[PDB]
Amino acid sequence: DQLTEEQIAEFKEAFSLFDKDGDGTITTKELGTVMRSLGQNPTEAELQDMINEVDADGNGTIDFPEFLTMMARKMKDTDSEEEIREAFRVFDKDGNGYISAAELRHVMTNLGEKLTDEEVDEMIREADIDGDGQVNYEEFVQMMTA
């Protein structure tokens, strides 16, 4: 999990949309100016909550390091979600939205592991939270995250 210089530069441009005066910090007033400029109207309490979620040192404003930490963490989340979606679609060989036992057995072989049907069936049972005998996308997400 890491960012390139170019990605950091883009996040600095995003930061500058919020840091209205260019001092290097985002205040609740600056975040509220942005939101109002988009037709929103959050309360002061809501704005402070949003600052606090990113404000790691508790000083009441968001600096670029704090902003970057947050954008990096969210980027890591988005990238993980895409990797899991791609892996799901590879397993769902016919594209019908469900991994069958035969698809699981064939795709694991293709990915480098030889399973018996005994093993395959056990894996389907482990994943199957809706009792339909197949692994759907949500079930696959739950296995890949726990």
């Binding site: 990797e83 056990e122 894996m123």
Partner: peptide, 18 residues
Amino acid sequence: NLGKHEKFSEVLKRLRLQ
């Protein structure tokens, strides 16, 4: 594991990280 077999979750985590 569950008894002598690997859990599905273990296999999937490894395949993704490969």
